[PDB]
Amino acid sequence: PFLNVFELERLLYTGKTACNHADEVWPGLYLGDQDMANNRRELRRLGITHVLNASHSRWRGTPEAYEGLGIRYLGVEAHDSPAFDMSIHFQTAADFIHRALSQPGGKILVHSAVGVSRSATLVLAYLMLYHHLTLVEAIKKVKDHRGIIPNRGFLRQLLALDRRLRQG
Amino acid sequence: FLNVFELERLLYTGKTACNHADEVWPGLYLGDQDMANNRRELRRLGITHVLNASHSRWRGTPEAYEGLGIRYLGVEAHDSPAFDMSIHFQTAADFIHRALSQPGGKILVHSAVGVSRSATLVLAYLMLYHHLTLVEAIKKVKDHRGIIPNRGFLRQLLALDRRLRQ
């Protein structure tokens, strides 16, 4: 009927972290939630050219408005569970983000359902691979602008990426 | 360097709170030092009591509070897992209770950053006066303000929870 401080901590980490539906966390890189992904007017207003859905649903498929908005789309199916292997998506998502930003005027929304875990993981991987931030560095840069908390398993995967990169 | 558990605390403690204070319970605002110094906001919100869980004894009661009629209790706590907040649980929950028992009463419980020292007394108040368990108190508050008491305060609230629930 009682717990230890570690389980309390895990519960506390499910508290409020997100303040807006999306935040620019890197020049031209917005990180946000499903609402922003479905907000045609805001996607219009912000000049969104690429969308990376890190929570792609085979049921809902590619949002129908993105064609009318000129949006290049990449959905990856992913589940926000410490047991899920998000690393299968690191390089394909990073490359996508790189070529979105590489384009003059390019602007990308990376999103999940909440915008704090699946999506945040791929952004942090993108900064590690393409800008050579440490895992801790990328976390500090992103959390300056959006309260992120990748699940424990995604953090363990990002730590392993951090290890492998810093060696080579 | 940093293990995953350290990465978690860095992410969740080092985020930027959406607001300088949040109503986490009816008439109970939990927030930071900025809000404590925000005369405009204090008046707009109708704050009638302030509990400074980060009180320094060489500053007194904030001077502006008397003219506003704001009643003050300062708790001289440090945000350290070695600091025993438990000796203040009751005196703090009492003050909060009197504030909220007053018609129109509204309290600001604050600390430096509004995540640990102040949050700890808010949780203790909810357990003592509304008989919530620690976990219930946390679920009540966490979606309004992303609190995270330091591990030692969590241990002292676990001690309280067990005592109150025999």
Numbering used by the authors:
A (entry chain B): 41 to 208
B (entry chain A): 42 to 207
Task: Give verbatim excerpts from the published study on this entry.
Dual-specificity phosphatases (DUSPs) are a group of protein tyrosine phosphatases (PTPs) that can dephosphorylate both phosphoserine/threonine and phosphotyrosine. Despite their various substrate specificities, DUSPs exhibit a conserved catalytic mechanism mediated by a catalytic triad consisting of a Cys, an Arg, and an Asp in the active site and a phosphate-binding loop (PTP-loop) with a “HCxxGxxRS(T)” consensus motif. As an atypical DUSP family member, DUSP26 consists of an N-terminal domain (residues 1–60) as well as a conserved catalytic domain (DUSP26-C, residues 61–211). DUSP26 dephosphorylates pSer20 and pSer37 in the p53 transactivation domain (TAD) to inhibit the p53 tumor suppressor function and thereby results in the chemoresistance of neuroblastoma cells to doxorubicin-induced apoptosis.
In this study, we determined the crystal structure of a catalytically active form of DUSP26 with an N-terminal extension (residues 39–211, referred to as DUSP26-N) at 2.0 Å resolution. To gain insight into the structural basis for the catalytic activity of DUSP26, we determined the crystal structure of a catalytically active form of DUSP26, DUSP26-N. Because the active site cysteine of the phosphatase with a low pKa value is susceptible to oxidation, we mutated the active site cysteine (Cys152) to serine, which does not affect the structure or substrate binding, for crystallization. As shown in the structure of DUSP26-C, the DUSP26-N (C152S) monomer contains a central twisted five-stranded β-sheet (β1-β5) sandwiched by two α-helix bundles. Despite their close resemblance, the most noticeable difference between DUSP26-N (C152S) and DUSP26-C lies in the presence of an additional α1-helix in the N-terminus of DUSP26-N (C152S). By contrast, similar to VHR, the DUSP26-N (C152S) monomer adopts a “fold-back” conformation of the C-terminal α8-helix, which is packed against the catalytic core from the same subunit to form a four-helix bundle. Structural comparison with the catalytically active VHR and catalytically inactive DUSP26-C and MKP-4 showed that DUSP26-N (C152S) adopts a canonically active PTP-loop conformation, which is highly similar to that of VHR. Unlike those of DUSP26-C, which are flipped away from the active site, the backbone amide atoms of Val156 and Ser157 in the PTP loop of DUSP26-N (C152S) are pointed into the active site pocket. Together with the backbone amides of residues 153–154 and the guanidinium group of Arg158, they generate a positive electrostatic potential, which is crucial for the catalytic reaction of the cysteine thiolate anion. In the DUSP26-N (C152S) structure, the canonically active PTP-loop conformation is stabilized through formation of hydrogen bonds with the surrounding α7-α8 loop: Gly155-Arg186, Val156-Ile189, Val156-Pro190, and Ser157-Asn191.
